[PDB]
Design a protein around this ligand. Sequence first.
Ligand SMILES: [Zn+2]
Ligand SMILES: [Zn+2]
Length: 597
Amino acid sequence: ATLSEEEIAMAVTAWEKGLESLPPLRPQQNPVLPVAGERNVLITSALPYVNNVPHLGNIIGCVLSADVFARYSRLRQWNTLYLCGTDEYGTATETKALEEGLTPQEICDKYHIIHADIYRWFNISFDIFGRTTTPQQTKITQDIFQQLLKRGFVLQDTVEQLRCEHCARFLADRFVEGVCPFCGYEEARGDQCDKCGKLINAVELKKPQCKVCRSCPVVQSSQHLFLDLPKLEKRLEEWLGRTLPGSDWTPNAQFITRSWLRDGLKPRCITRDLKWGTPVPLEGFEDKVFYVWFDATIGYLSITANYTDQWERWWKNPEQVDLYQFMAKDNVPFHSLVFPCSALGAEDNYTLVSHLIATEYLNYEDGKFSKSRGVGVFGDMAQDTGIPADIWRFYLLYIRPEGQDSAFSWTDLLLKNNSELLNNLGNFINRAGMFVSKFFGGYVPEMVLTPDDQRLLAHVTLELQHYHQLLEKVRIRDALRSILTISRHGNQYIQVNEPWKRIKGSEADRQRAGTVTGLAVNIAALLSVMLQPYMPTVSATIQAQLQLPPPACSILLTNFLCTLPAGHQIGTVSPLFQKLENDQIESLRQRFGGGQA
Ligand SMILES: [Zn+2]
Ligand SMILES: [Zn+2]
């Protein structure tokens, strides 16, 4: 395409300015804390439930999406804190621990390691990967509760529940049978009678029976606490009306939030009759814990608290901190309604989310991931495929479900690997490094820019600015395509100039070959940095092959610079990517298809 004279002029000028356009990068901090006058970016990924092995769908929607923005944020020299951790409390944990013959603490410890190992293999750059089963979780949850309680946002009511005294617990509708009080059907459930269709309350059943021990449950009244959401609806919508417009909340999250408010919020129970949970500091609640519906989102705070006692500088500092929250759309109500209401009702100057990033679902082939049916790739099986992490990262991010659902496809993975990585991105960077190493003893040639060279340079800068424009608004999927667009321009540039041929010609031809070569390898250097949020290992590999200086590796400016000036010596080059074969892929497809085992 055609650009203005000034656009080209500005691009060339910035490019020639070279390495000292780079600011002397600040030394890393631990713990990372907000700096006044600078941008401070707080990033959370939704806390995965601990006792389920995560699959690719879980990873792309949360930890991997958050990782890309986190890495980009650091390249922009923003003070970045990316945190996550395992969600561990609840009835599900008690049930699963029983099935595995372990204590709740035991099975949680076991599966936390599994999560941590999986995310470590996928190279997720957490600043903290924590847990919700800590004393700080208890302290911070109880504090927020007290603040809400003393401001009249907590209700207390009695609820009639069936209780199996033999099993010593309150029964869910699932585990209750009885006679229908409407038609006399003898096998009615606690939730509904399948004979007459009537939706009932389990407490209304005649001759109720526990499905487990077959004894007779009794109706007992138990005390529960409720969060008074209707009273908080006003201050919540004030905040939303103030922060939603002009934000980068994903459209699906915005619709979901508004749709809940249209129906009107109701008081929600925040207590449960469990043992495994955060204790409630109130009289008569010694055998009750906080419902994970309420305190799971507080986990973000306690995880940060275990990281630094200065955690309030992040989570109680809205004027300084921009919070990004990544999740799948199911988690949206807890992040757009529940915690904001709790925080706003606490009146403790809490940092609320500025940009809620919610994805749609990643499906597997023509259906769902399923552990029970053995369908789909789960996080712990990825390592065993012979396909490295960055390849998984590339494909998942290439098909990241942003506007609509996406589907993992083995055929598509092979096709996009061979076409975009091998025949495009890899083919450019391989040739750029090869030409330097083969024709110039590993030294970057002198670059004498022709008008055509200046055009390409300017095109690269404009696409780079497009890349920034997108990722600034968390347009992950499209920013990856900007990278591939640059390498596409680069391949076209190399192919039309044929430097590997001209190098065998006149001294004029040889100078052209040198210019093309040096310019190409500088584009290769830029790509390595742009690629870092997406494929961190490949990024490091390229930078090692080109011996790109560390300050150039850790910052991405909005202009295309000459990071590899003439005379710079590169290392030893080697093909970046391996092709994927039909035999290899069909074997993997059959393995995770469900037709086996
Ligand atoms: Zn009935
Ligand atoms: Zn029972």
